[PDB]
Write a protein that binds this ligand. Structure first.
Ligand SMILES: *[C@@H]1O[C@H](CO)[C@@H](O[C@@H]2O[C@H](CO)[C@@H](O)[C@H](O)[C@H]2NC(C)=O)[C@H](O)[C@H]1NC(C)=O
Ligand SMILES: *[C@@H]1O[C@H](CO)[C@@H](O[C@@H]2O[C@H](CO)[C@@H](O)[C@H](O)[C@H]2NC(C)=O)[C@H](O)[C@H]1NC(C)=O
Ligand SMILES: *[C@@H]1O[C@H](CO)[C@@H](O)[C@H](O)[C@H]1NC(C)=O
Ligand SMILES: *[C@@H]1O[C@H](CO)[C@@H](O)[C@H](O)[C@H]1NC(C)=O
Ligand SMILES: *[C@@H]1O[C@H](CO)[C@@H](O)[C@H](O)[C@H]1NC(C)=O
Ligand SMILES: *[C@@H]1O[C@H](CO)[C@@H](O)[C@H](O)[C@H]1NC(C)=O
Ligand SMILES: *[C@@H]1O[C@H](CO)[C@@H](O)[C@H](O)[C@H]1NC(C)=O
Ligand SMILES: *[C@@H]1O[C@H](CO)[C@@H](O)[C@H](O)[C@H]1NC(C)=O
Ligand SMILES: *[C@@H]1O[C@H](CO)[C@@H](O)[C@H](O)[C@H]1NC(C)=O
Lengths: 276, 48, 44, 49, 382, 48
């Protein structure tokens, strides 16, 4: 656990409406041209979310905003960035080695999921920097000290995610939904090109991506930020760890009855809340 | 069922065993409602 | 806008499945009227 | 007149199930009555037209 | 023959002129197929059965079983099986179904507390150390372990939790050893209103059978919700399409015809459904092909008779089915009613109400006597 | 019952245990059919 000295900035929690986003497939069953009324842990329509930001200033002060947020019954995570500052998330109750915790790390070549009794630092983060001034690489030393009593390790998803380019704005509309089932932890994802600047108005179903049968206890969740040892902003001689602009939103799920509209073609095209 | 009060059965019994009695009361009250609705429909036809 | 016609075939579910086909598959059949609409038109 | 519908019990209740069909006979004639009522309704529709 | 069926239907030996509804013809299946995944490696139940130590109930051992073939015959190879009772699943049928995720749990339980391992049970062990879900859908094997887990000096290695603020929700594990507080007085150690929640069995071999230690293994398998990966050792046969057959797709039994699908399943989905919530499409576990499921043709059967006094000739109307399908099924001996009416080419007529077999279609037009449907009527004429 | 498909109940249970689920589903479907026939009879009277 090595943390360079930084001018830490108190977290800013701007509030914004949630619009109609946050619709995922309740189950693997395929239906077409039906009006399915379902009860599940959705995201209530036109709800309110906590908008955080993460950037490094030109005055030597870097905004390090990684607060600790309740999980309750679910979390809708949406992210948008250029350099993939959000490289993963950490889940747990007390954030120590006493109880098992869930951790996800993006290796930029694969996706790492480790569920052990990790011992995190005060502000754990992934150490990414240059090697021999030729290549980029990341290290997990700055996140945890030691791993003991491991119960689930997962290394898969050899996808780089953002690959189309930065046409609209980084083309990085990334949405995740985490559900704390009794014996499962589900992840749903969808990548969308930018229409506008941030948080556009539209509908997009969230197909499931990965299923985790960990069966662990989660109460709290926290997000990890990528820290690169300079060499990001051209024309800057500041030899220090710098982080690019990062924006993400967290919504809280609730037990709601929805009305999904599967088209005649396979994909969900619209949904209506039954209590809005 | 043991009793005609839902709360009494709920409090005095564990869920899995009380499920049978709650189902019995549900069946009885559903039959009562369906009988009322059927007689209302017949009387509605006569009144029409 | 409306049943039986000649629904003995369900078109191999070319475009999903209609309500009538689903009902037919569980003992729900509709018998055709005795007088076809041509005969009703002739009577009128 | 209205649509003439004929409903088959055994297919609706115990569709392709020998055990359920055998268990259905224990309920007496609760299906000859349904078939008779629906047939009467259909004949009545034809008579109405 | 159809006339006898009408006689049975009317419960009379004489049949008046008319058209009567007798039964429902059905195209019976020819073959039976089973499609199971390629997996062959056996699941290691013996390792959780050869567990040299059994964890305490408050921290009961839990292991997952997946991506393997489960042969529950090895359960009977164990000798004692003091309590072998399966919830929601037939123990004899365990060898045929397919489960998605099998969870195996093991612990050592009190001799007379075996009956407390069940949904909604009352008692300390039920709601303070190990709570089963109210909708438990698995099996459990229990047996005594006196000759493995009894010490003459006493077995204090195993413990149970008895004091806590609230009861445990089902499938919840509590491992903390924090002291218990009674009332509102703060607790800092052993003393008044403060007791150690963990107490030991103190098992001894000299104790009675009801006081003997008992090893218990819990096999909780979640039912069909699509991503099945643990299947029985039943062998799979070849797949046949465009023929009414009995299918068994990954544990989904039924009867219907199979065909290629134009519906595009996304990679994660396994089987489709109808709007009336009936299984309609299934993806083949082996070839990863998506197929429809359409039930074999059926429909009512109506017997047209001119009255049993006039003649014994009858005409059968197969409701809502083309004559091609009926003729093919008859030629293949698949119709459920086995009294095939003689067909001579001109005895087959296709009405809008169905297929009329046994009656000749004339070009004339008379005031019709026996109503068939859709402007078609039948009568007995020279 | 435990499932709305008779094939599933038949496959996953022994006959003597599956009798109960089969009977529960029979009762439910018979009640539904009786309700449908009664409503159809009243509608038929109105249409006549
Ligand atoms: C429905 O899914 C199908 C998958 O093919 C898509 O259909 C194609 O649509 C394009 C654009 O109109 C046509 O050029 C192709 O000929 C279609 N292919 C077919 C019909 O096989 C279609 O885009 C989807 N509809 C959506 C997403 O709204
Ligand atoms: C339960 O006990 C087993 C040993 O009996 C522990 O170790 C597991 O052993 C099985 C084979 O018996 C392996 O397949 C697993 O990979 C092992 N798990 C490991 C090493 O973590 C097991 O950990 C125990 N589980 C619990 C929840 O206590
Ligand atoms: C979200 O929180 C803000 C806090 O000021 C509140 O004003 C707003 O109404 C909230 N949104 C909803 C939809 O309740
Ligand atoms: C990331 O991927 C590289 C290969 O690209 C591999 O060698 C390494 O172990 C992975 N994990 C890291 C750097 O944590
Ligand atoms: C791991 O398990 C051991 C053995 O039960 C236990 O003593 C220890 O506290 C656990 N945690 C760690 C971090 O080693
Ligand atoms: C029956 O076959 C005839 C002759 O091709 C055709 O006109 C009719 O549409 C078919 N009906 C069905 C249900 O297949
Ligand atoms: C379990 O028990 C004995 C030792 O007690 C061992 O030799 C045997 O091989 C084990 N059983 C299996 C099936 O491996
Ligand atoms: C999970 O941990 C929280 C926080 O300590 C606790 O309140 C809750 O009871 C735990 N739930 C389970 C199922 O263990
Ligand atoms: C099963 O084996 C067949 C060939 O026998 C192969 O085509 C198919 O992909 C395999 N299924 C798997 C590996 O899931």
């Amino acid at each position: 656990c090595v943390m360079p000295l930084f001018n830490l900035i108190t977290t800013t929690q701007s509030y914004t409406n949630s619009f109609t986003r946050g619709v995922y497939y309740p189950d693997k069953v395929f239906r077409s041209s039906v009006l399915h009324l379902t009860q599940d842990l959705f995201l209530p329509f036109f709800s309110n979310v906590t908008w955080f930001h993460a950037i490094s200033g030109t005055n030597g002060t870097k905004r390090f905003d990684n607060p600790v947020l309740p999980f309750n019954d679910g979390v809708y995570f949406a992210s948008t960035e250029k350099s993939n500052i959000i490289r993963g998330w950490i889940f747990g109750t007390t954030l120590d080695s006493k109880t098992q915790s869930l951790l996800i790390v993006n290796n930029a070549t694969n996706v790492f999921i480790k569920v052990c009794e990790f011992q995190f630092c005060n502000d754990p983060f992934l150490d990414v920097y240059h090697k021999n001034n030729k290549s980029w690489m990341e290290s997990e030393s700055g996140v945890y000290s030691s791993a003991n009593n491991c119960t689930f390790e997962y290394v898969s998803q050899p996808f780089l995610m953002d690959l189309e380019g930065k046409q609209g704005n980084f083309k990085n509309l990334r949405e995740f939904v985490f559900k704390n089932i009794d014996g499962y932890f589900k992840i749903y994802s969808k990548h969308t090109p930018i229409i506008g600047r941030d948080f556009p108005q539209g509908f997009s179903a969230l197909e499931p991506l990965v299923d985790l049968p960990i069966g662990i206890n989660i109460t709290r969740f926290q997000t990890l930020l990528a820290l690169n040892r300079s060499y990001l902003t051209p024309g800057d001689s500041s030899s220090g760890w710098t982080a690019g602009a990062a924006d993400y939103y967290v919504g809280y799920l609730q037990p709601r009855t929805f009305l999904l509209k599967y088209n005649e073609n396979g994909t969900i095209t619209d949904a209506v809340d039954c209590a809005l | 069922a043991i009793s005609s009060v839902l709360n009494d059965i709920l409090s005095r019994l564990d869920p899995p065993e009380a499920e049978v009695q709650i189902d019995r009361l549900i069946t009885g009250r559903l039959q009562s409602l369906q009988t009322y609705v059927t007689q209302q429909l017949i009387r509605a036809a006569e009144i029409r | 806008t409306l049943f039986i016609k000649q629904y003995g075939d369900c078109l191999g579910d070319i475009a999903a499945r209609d309500l009538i086909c689903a009902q037919k598959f569980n003992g729900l059949t509709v018998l055709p009227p005795l007088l076809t609409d041509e005969m009703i038109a002739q009577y009128t | 007149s209205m649509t003439k519908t004929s409903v088959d019990c055994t297919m609706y209740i115990c569709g392709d199930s020998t055990e359920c069909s055998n268990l259905l006979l224990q309920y007496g004639s609760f299906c000859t009555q349904l078939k008779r009522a629906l047939t009467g309704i259909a004949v009545e529709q034809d008579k109405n037209t | 023959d159809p006339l006898s069926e009408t006689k049975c239907t009317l419960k009379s030996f004489t049949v008046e002129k008319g058209i009567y509804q007798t039964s429902n013809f059905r195209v019976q299946p020819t073959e039976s197929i089973v499609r199971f995944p390629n997996v062959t490696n056996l699941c290691p139940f013996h390792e959780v059965f050869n567990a040299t130590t059994f964890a305490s109930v408050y921290a009961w051992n839990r292991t997952r079983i997946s991506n393997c073939v489960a042969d529950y015959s090895v359960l009977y190879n164990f000798a004692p099986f003091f309590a072998f009772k399966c919830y929601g699943v037939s123990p004899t049928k365990l060898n045929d179904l397919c489960f998605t995720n099998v969870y195996a749990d093991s612990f050592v339980i009190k001799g007379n507390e075996v009956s407390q391992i069940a949904p909604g049970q009352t008692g300390n062990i039920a709601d303070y150390n190990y709570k089963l879900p109210d909708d438990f859908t698995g099996c459990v094997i229990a047996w005594n372990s006196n000759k493995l887990d009894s010490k003459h000096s006493g077995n204090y290695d195993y413990w149970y939790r008895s004091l806590r603020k609230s009861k445990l929700k089902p499938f919840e594990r509590d491992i903390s050893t924090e002291i218990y507080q009674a009332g509102n007085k703060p607790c800092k150690g052993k003393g008044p209103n403060c007791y150690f929640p963990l107490q030991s069995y103190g098992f001894r071999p000299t104790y009675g059978v009801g006081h003997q230690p008992y090893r218990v293994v819990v096999l909780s398998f979640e039912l069909l919700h699509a991503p099945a990966t643990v299947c029985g050792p039943k062998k799979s046969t070849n797949l046949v399409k465009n023929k009414c057959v009995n299918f068994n797709f990954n544990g989904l039994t039924g009867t219907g015809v199979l065909t290629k699908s134009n519906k595009k399943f996304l990679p994660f989905q396994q089987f489709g459904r109808d709007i009336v919530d009936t299984t309609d499409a299934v993806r083949d576990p082996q070839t990863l092909e998506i197929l429809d499921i359409t039930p074999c043709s059926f429909g009512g059967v109506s017997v047209i008779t001119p009255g049993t006094n006039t003649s014994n000739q009858v005409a059968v109307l197969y409701q809502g089915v083309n004559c091609t399908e009926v003729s093919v099924a008859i030629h293949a001996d698949q119709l459920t009613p086995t009294w095939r009416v003689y067909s001579t080419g001109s005895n087959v007529f296709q009405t809008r109400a169905g297929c009329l077999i046994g009656a000749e279609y004339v070009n004339n037009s008379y005031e019709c006597d026996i109503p068939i449907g859709a402007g078609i009527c039948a009568s007995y004429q020279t």
